[PDB]
Structure 1
Amino acid sequence: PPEAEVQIDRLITGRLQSLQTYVTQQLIRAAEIRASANLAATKMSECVL
């Protein structure tokens, strides 16, 4: 256990960094998708209705 908490620390840091990167990219992509959905709603109101 004394020497197993240093490699596990590296694994934790790497996996946390991967998760944070995924969440950030997904947030940006979700912002883009929200803009596209707002455009779709505007087209539905202005043109279909």
Structure 2
Amino acid sequence: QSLQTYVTQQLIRAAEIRASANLAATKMSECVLGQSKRVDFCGKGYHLM
């Protein structure tokens, strides 16, 4: 009952990290490899690089 609780928490945690890894790859695409015009997505201000 202790491992099923730990593993259920790691599966939920890893989904929060997944959402953050998907967001990090989405910034590294649009925000580093480009110049995204999406307001406040890429620092406060107008985004240069």
Letter in 2 for 1:42: T
Unaligned 5+ segments in structure 1 are: 1-16
Based on CA coordinates, which of the two structures has the bigger radius of gyration?
Answer: 1
Which ranges of 4 or more aligned residues in structure 1 deviate by more than 2 Å? none
Match in the other structure for 1:10: none
Higher RCO (CA 8 Å, separation ≥ 6 residues): 2
1:24 aligns with 2:4: no
Higher helix share: 1
Equivalent residues, number: 33
CA RMSD in angstroms, aligned pairs only: 0.3
